Amino acid sequence: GKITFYEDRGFQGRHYECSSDHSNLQPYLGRCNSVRVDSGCWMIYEQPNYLGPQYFLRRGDYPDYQQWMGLNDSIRSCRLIPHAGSHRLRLYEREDYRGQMIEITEDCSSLQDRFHFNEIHSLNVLEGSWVLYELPNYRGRQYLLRPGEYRRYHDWGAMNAKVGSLRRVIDIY
Amino acid sequence: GKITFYEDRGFQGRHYECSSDHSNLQPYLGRCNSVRVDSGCWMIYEQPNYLGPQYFLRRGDYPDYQQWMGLNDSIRSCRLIPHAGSHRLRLYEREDYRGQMIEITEDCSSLQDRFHFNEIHSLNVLEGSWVLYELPNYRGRQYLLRPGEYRRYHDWGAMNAKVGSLRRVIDIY
């Protein structure tokens, strides 16, 4: 993949280009006000070492931080999210894989409407990466879910078990 | 009505309880090798949206799929068959309601024996729901017939016009 970060709005200023995961953009970029995603699906984070709020971005032009639904111009690390041919995920009602389990292979814009669930307490990401949204219709705080187990909501980095929508991470060509 | 599906034989593993129609059980059940029907008469289908092979089940326990004469352990949808206090059906010799017409208001273990027919090309279900079996004594492939007309066999989901027995969807509770 290939992503280019710019210090100022509208693709101006000092810029930095990445073709891979970057744990601390700080020495090469003072702030991030626009981004051009040439290829790949990327998750960008507010602090180094993949901490803080995260935002999913796919191929396209982002002339301002609001275009990626960003909160501010602090972007300090990023991950290139590998493409997956298939997506499969199990959501559990209680911590540690307990209570009712629901398995999904497609995007879900509303968990409450589709399955009458408003919170997920544990999950197992079997295949592909997904982005978990706190609010329906893919809004709210975003959390990247990569293949693997998450026994509690803290493990995917949320502050609570609230989930509103889920989307698989797929390439836009 | 109330039915409980289990992923494993003998009522073990992940289960899911239903009390109404479900066009897609895939998220709640990865397979089905046992069913416990507490009430109602139900049709279960191999595919979502009531497609593929169909099987009729009434109150009672089914410890394995052979119990409901299933072909395998894939159950993707199910529907509660509303009861009726009366049944009436007209079978036709030929497609589109032509040829001899036989009207029955009771179960028929053998079509060939009783009416000397081996195939039915069209039907008109006037009252109640019936289950048509490809073979005598109520075995073979099953097809739920709800009130309504069927110009041809494809209409009730069969692969050919062969009919062996017919049974009225009657309740034990």
Coordinates of C-alpha atoms in Angstrom, one line a residue:
Chain A
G1 CA 0.0 0.0 0.0
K2 CA 1.1 3.6 0.0
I3 CA -0.1 6.6 2.1
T4 CA 1.1 10.2 2.1
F5 CA 0.6 12.5 5.1
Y6 CA 0.7 16.3 4.8
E7 CA 1.1 18.8 7.6
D8 CA -1.3 21.3 6.1
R9 CA -4.8 21.1 4.7
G10 CA -5.3 20.4 1.0
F11 CA -2.1 18.4 0.4
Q12 CA 0.2 21.2 1.2
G13 CA 3.2 21.4 3.5
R14 CA 5.8 19.0 4.7
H15 CA 4.7 15.5 3.8
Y16 CA 5.7 12.0 4.5
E17 CA 5.0 8.8 2.6
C18 CA 4.7 5.3 4.0
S19 CA 4.4 1.9 2.4
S20 CA 4.1 0.1 5.7
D21 CA 3.3 0.1 9.4
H22 CA 4.9 3.1 11.2
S23 CA 5.0 3.2 15.0
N24 CA 6.0 6.9 15.4
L25 CA 5.6 9.4 12.6
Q26 CA 6.6 12.2 15.0
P27 CA 10.1 12.9 13.7
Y28 CA 8.9 13.0 10.0
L29 CA 5.6 14.8 10.5
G30 CA 4.6 17.4 13.0
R31 CA 0.9 17.2 12.6
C32 CA -1.5 15.8 10.0
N33 CA -4.1 17.9 8.2
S34 CA -4.6 16.0 4.9
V35 CA -3.8 12.5 3.5
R36 CA -3.7 10.9 0.1
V37 CA -4.2 7.2 0.2
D38 CA -2.8 5.8 -3.0
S39 CA -3.5 2.1 -2.3
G40 CA -4.3 -0.1 0.6
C41 CA -6.6 0.2 3.7
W42 CA -4.9 1.9 6.6
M43 CA -5.7 2.5 10.2
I44 CA -4.2 5.8 11.5
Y45 CA -3.8 6.6 15.2
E46 CA -3.5 9.7 17.3
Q47 CA -0.4 8.6 19.3
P48 CA 2.7 6.5 18.6
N49 CA 2.8 2.8 19.0
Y50 CA -0.8 2.4 17.8
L51 CA -2.4 4.1 20.8
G52 CA -5.2 6.7 21.0
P53 CA -8.2 7.1 18.7
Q54 CA -7.9 5.3 15.4
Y55 CA -9.4 6.0 12.0
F56 CA -9.9 3.7 9.1
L57 CA -9.0 5.1 5.7
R58 CA -9.1 3.4 2.2
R59 CA -7.8 4.6 -1.2
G60 CA -8.8 8.3 -1.8
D61 CA -8.0 11.9 -1.0
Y62 CA -8.6 13.4 2.4
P63 CA -8.1 17.2 2.2
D64 CA -8.8 17.8 5.9
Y65 CA -8.9 15.6 9.0
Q66 CA -12.7 15.8 9.0
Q67 CA -12.8 13.8 5.8
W68 CA -11.6 10.7 7.8
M69 CA -13.9 11.7 10.6
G70 CA -10.8 12.7 12.5
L71 CA -11.0 14.7 15.7
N72 CA -7.8 16.7 15.4
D73 CA -4.6 16.9 13.4
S74 CA -2.6 14.6 15.6
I75 CA -1.6 11.4 13.6
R76 CA 1.4 9.6 15.1
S77 CA 1.4 6.0 13.9
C78 CA -0.3 3.9 11.2
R79 CA -1.0 0.3 10.1
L80 CA -1.4 -1.0 6.6
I81 CA -4.3 -3.5 7.0
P82 CA -3.7 -6.7 4.8
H83 CA -6.4 -7.7 2.4
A84 CA -8.4 -10.8 3.4
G85 CA -10.3 -12.9 0.8
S86 CA -12.8 -13.9 3.5
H87 CA -14.2 -12.5 6.7
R88 CA -15.7 -14.3 9.6
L89 CA -16.3 -13.2 13.2
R90 CA -17.9 -14.4 16.4
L91 CA -19.5 -11.9 18.8
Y92 CA -20.3 -13.1 22.3
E93 CA -22.7 -11.7 24.8
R94 CA -20.5 -12.1 27.9
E95 CA -16.8 -11.8 28.7
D96 CA -14.5 -14.7 27.8
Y97 CA -16.6 -16.2 25.1
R98 CA -19.7 -16.8 27.2
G99 CA -23.4 -16.3 26.7
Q100 CA -25.0 -16.3 23.3
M101 CA -22.6 -16.3 20.3
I102 CA -23.5 -14.8 16.9
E103 CA -21.3 -15.5 13.9
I104 CA -21.1 -13.0 11.0
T105 CA -19.5 -12.9 7.6
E106 CA -20.9 -9.6 6.2
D107 CA -21.1 -6.0 7.2
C108 CA -23.7 -5.1 9.8
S109 CA -24.8 -1.4 9.9
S110 CA -26.9 -1.9 12.9
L111 CA -26.3 -4.6 15.5
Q112 CA -29.4 -3.5 17.6
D113 CA -31.7 -3.7 14.6
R114 CA -30.2 -6.9 13.1
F115 CA -29.6 -8.9 16.2
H116 CA -31.0 -6.9 19.1
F117 CA -27.5 -6.6 20.7
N118 CA -26.2 -3.2 21.8
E119 CA -22.9 -4.4 23.5
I120 CA -20.3 -7.1 22.7
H121 CA -18.3 -8.4 25.6
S122 CA -15.8 -10.8 23.8
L123 CA -15.0 -11.7 20.3
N124 CA -13.0 -14.1 18.2
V125 CA -11.9 -12.7 14.8
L126 CA -11.5 -15.9 12.7
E127 CA -10.8 -14.4 9.3
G128 CA -10.1 -11.0 7.9
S129 CA -9.8 -7.6 9.6
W130 CA -12.9 -5.6 10.5
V131 CA -13.5 -2.1 12.0
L132 CA -15.8 -2.0 15.0
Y133 CA -17.9 1.2 15.3
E134 CA -19.5 2.4 18.5
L135 CA -22.5 3.7 16.6
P136 CA -24.8 2.3 13.9
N137 CA -24.2 3.3 10.3
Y138 CA -20.4 3.3 10.9
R139 CA -20.0 6.3 13.0
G140 CA -18.5 6.9 16.5
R141 CA -15.2 5.8 17.8
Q142 CA -13.6 3.2 15.6
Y143 CA -11.6 0.2 16.6
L144 CA -9.6 -2.1 14.3
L145 CA -10.2 -5.8 14.9
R146 CA -7.5 -8.0 13.4
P147 CA -7.7 -11.9 13.4
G148 CA -7.4 -13.2 16.9
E149 CA -9.2 -13.4 20.2
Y150 CA -10.3 -10.6 22.5
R151 CA -11.6 -11.8 25.8
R152 CA -12.9 -8.4 27.0
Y153 CA -13.7 -5.0 25.3
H154 CA -10.5 -3.5 26.7
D155 CA -8.6 -5.9 24.4
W156 CA -9.8 -4.1 21.2
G157 CA -9.1 -0.9 23.1
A158 CA -12.6 0.4 23.8
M159 CA -13.7 2.0 27.0
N160 CA -17.0 0.1 27.1
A161 CA -18.8 -2.8 25.4
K162 CA -20.9 -0.5 23.2
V163 CA -21.0 -1.5 19.5
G164 CA -23.2 -0.2 16.8
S165 CA -21.9 -1.5 13.5
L166 CA -19.2 -3.6 12.0
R167 CA -17.6 -3.5 8.6
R168 CA -15.1 -5.8 6.9
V169 CA -11.9 -4.2 5.7
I170 CA -11.9 -4.7 1.9
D171 CA -9.8 -3.0 -0.8
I172 CA -11.4 -0.4 -3.1
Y173 CA -9.9 -2.1 -6.1
Chain B
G1 CA -44.9 -22.6 18.8
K2 CA -41.4 -23.3 20.1
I3 CA -38.5 -25.3 18.7
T4 CA -34.9 -25.6 19.8
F5 CA -32.1 -26.5 17.4
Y6 CA -28.8 -28.1 18.6
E7 CA -25.5 -28.2 16.7
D8 CA -24.6 -31.7 17.9
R9 CA -26.5 -35.0 18.3
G10 CA -28.4 -35.9 21.4
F11 CA -29.2 -32.4 22.3
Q12 CA -25.7 -31.2 22.9
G13 CA -23.7 -28.2 21.9
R14 CA -24.7 -24.7 20.9
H15 CA -28.5 -24.5 20.6
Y16 CA -30.9 -21.8 19.5
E17 CA -34.6 -21.5 20.4
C18 CA -37.3 -20.2 18.0
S19 CA -40.9 -19.4 18.5
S20 CA -41.5 -17.9 15.0
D21 CA -40.3 -18.0 11.4
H22 CA -36.6 -17.4 10.8
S23 CA -35.4 -16.9 7.2
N24 CA -31.8 -17.1 8.2
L25 CA -30.4 -19.2 11.1
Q26 CA -26.9 -19.1 10.0
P27 CA -25.7 -16.5 12.5
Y28 CA -27.1 -18.6 15.4
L29 CA -26.4 -22.1 14.4
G30 CA -23.4 -23.5 12.5
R31 CA -25.1 -26.9 11.9
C32 CA -28.0 -28.9 13.2
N33 CA -28.0 -32.6 14.4
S34 CA -30.8 -32.4 16.9
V35 CA -34.1 -30.7 17.5
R36 CA -36.4 -30.6 20.4
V37 CA -39.9 -29.4 19.3
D38 CA -42.0 -28.2 22.3
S39 CA -44.9 -27.0 20.4
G40 CA -46.2 -26.2 17.0
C41 CA -45.7 -27.9 13.6
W42 CA -42.6 -26.7 11.8
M43 CA -41.0 -26.9 8.4
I44 CA -37.1 -26.7 8.5
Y45 CA -35.1 -26.0 5.4
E46 CA -31.5 -26.7 4.3
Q47 CA -31.1 -23.1 3.0
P48 CA -32.0 -19.6 4.1
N49 CA -35.2 -18.0 2.8
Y50 CA -37.0 -21.3 2.9
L51 CA -35.1 -22.8 0.0
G52 CA -33.7 -26.3 -0.6
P53 CA -34.8 -29.6 1.0
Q54 CA -37.6 -29.2 3.5
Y55 CA -38.5 -31.3 6.5
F56 CA -41.7 -31.4 8.7
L57 CA -41.5 -31.8 12.4
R58 CA -44.2 -31.8 15.0
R59 CA -43.9 -31.8 18.9
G60 CA -41.3 -34.2 20.2
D61 CA -37.6 -35.0 20.2
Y62 CA -35.3 -35.6 17.2
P63 CA -31.9 -36.9 18.6
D64 CA -30.3 -37.0 15.1
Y65 CA -31.1 -35.7 11.6
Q66 CA -32.3 -39.1 10.5
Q67 CA -35.1 -38.6 12.9
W68 CA -36.7 -35.9 10.6
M69 CA -35.4 -37.7 7.5
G70 CA -32.9 -35.1 6.8
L71 CA -30.2 -35.5 4.2
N72 CA -27.5 -33.8 6.2
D73 CA -27.0 -31.5 9.2
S74 CA -27.5 -28.1 7.4
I75 CA -30.7 -26.3 8.6
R76 CA -30.7 -22.6 7.5
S77 CA -34.3 -21.5 8.0
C78 CA -37.6 -22.7 9.6
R79 CA -41.2 -21.7 9.6
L80 CA -44.1 -22.4 12.0
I81 CA -47.0 -23.9 10.1
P82 CA -50.3 -22.3 11.3
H83 CA -52.9 -24.8 12.2
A84 CA -56.3 -25.0 10.5
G85 CA -59.3 -26.9 11.8
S86 CA -60.0 -28.1 8.2
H87 CA -58.2 -29.4 5.1
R88 CA -59.2 -29.6 1.5
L89 CA -57.0 -30.0 -1.6
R90 CA -57.5 -30.7 -5.3
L91 CA -54.9 -32.7 -7.2
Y92 CA -54.8 -32.4 -11.1
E93 CA -53.9 -34.9 -13.7
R94 CA -52.1 -32.2 -15.7
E95 CA -50.3 -28.9 -15.5
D96 CA -52.4 -25.8 -15.0
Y97 CA -55.4 -27.5 -13.6
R98 CA -56.3 -29.7 -16.5
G99 CA -57.1 -33.4 -16.7
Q100 CA -58.9 -35.3 -13.9
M101 CA -59.2 -33.5 -10.6
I102 CA -59.4 -35.5 -7.3
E103 CA -60.3 -33.6 -4.2
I104 CA -59.2 -35.0 -0.8
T105 CA -59.9 -33.8 2.8
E106 CA -57.9 -36.5 4.5
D107 CA -54.4 -38.0 4.7
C108 CA -53.3 -40.4 1.9
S109 CA -50.7 -43.0 2.7
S110 CA -50.7 -44.1 -0.9
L111 CA -51.7 -42.1 -4.0
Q112 CA -50.9 -45.0 -6.4
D113 CA -52.9 -47.4 -4.4
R114 CA -55.9 -45.2 -3.5
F115 CA -56.3 -43.2 -6.7
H116 CA -53.9 -44.9 -9.0
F117 CA -51.9 -41.8 -9.6
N118 CA -48.1 -41.6 -9.4
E119 CA -47.6 -38.0 -10.4
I120 CA -49.6 -34.9 -9.9
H121 CA -48.9 -32.0 -12.2
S122 CA -50.8 -29.2 -10.5
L123 CA -52.6 -28.6 -7.2
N124 CA -54.9 -26.2 -5.6
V125 CA -54.7 -26.1 -1.8
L126 CA -58.1 -24.7 -0.6
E127 CA -58.0 -25.3 3.2
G128 CA -55.1 -26.0 5.5
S129 CA -51.5 -26.9 5.0
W130 CA -50.4 -30.4 3.8
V131 CA -47.1 -32.1 3.4
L132 CA -46.6 -33.9 0.1
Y133 CA -44.0 -36.8 0.2
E134 CA -42.4 -38.3 -2.9
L135 CA -43.0 -41.8 -1.6
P136 CA -45.7 -43.9 0.1
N137 CA -46.3 -44.0 3.8
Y138 CA -44.8 -40.5 4.1
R139 CA -41.2 -40.9 3.3
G140 CA -38.9 -39.6 0.7
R141 CA -38.6 -35.8 -0.1
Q142 CA -41.1 -33.5 1.6
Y143 CA -42.9 -30.4 0.3
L144 CA -44.9 -28.1 2.4
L145 CA -48.2 -27.1 0.5
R146 CA -49.8 -24.0 2.0
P147 CA -53.2 -22.6 0.8
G148 CA -52.9 -21.4 -2.8
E149 CA -52.4 -22.7 -6.3
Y150 CA -49.5 -24.5 -7.9
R151 CA -49.6 -24.5 -11.7
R152 CA -46.7 -26.9 -11.8
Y153 CA -44.5 -29.1 -9.6
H154 CA -41.6 -26.7 -9.7
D155 CA -44.1 -24.4 -7.7
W156 CA -44.0 -26.7 -4.7
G157 CA -40.3 -27.0 -5.0
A158 CA -40.0 -30.5 -6.3
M159 CA -37.7 -31.9 -9.0
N160 CA -40.4 -33.9 -10.7
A161 CA -44.2 -34.5 -10.6
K162 CA -43.9 -37.7 -8.5
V163 CA -46.1 -38.0 -5.5
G164 CA -46.4 -40.9 -3.0
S165 CA -48.4 -39.7 0.0
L166 CA -50.0 -36.6 1.4
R167 CA -50.6 -35.7 5.0
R168 CA -52.6 -32.9 6.7
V169 CA -50.6 -30.6 8.9
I170 CA -52.4 -31.5 12.2
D171 CA -51.4 -30.6 15.7
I172 CA -50.5 -32.6 18.8
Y173 CA -49.5 -29.3 20.6

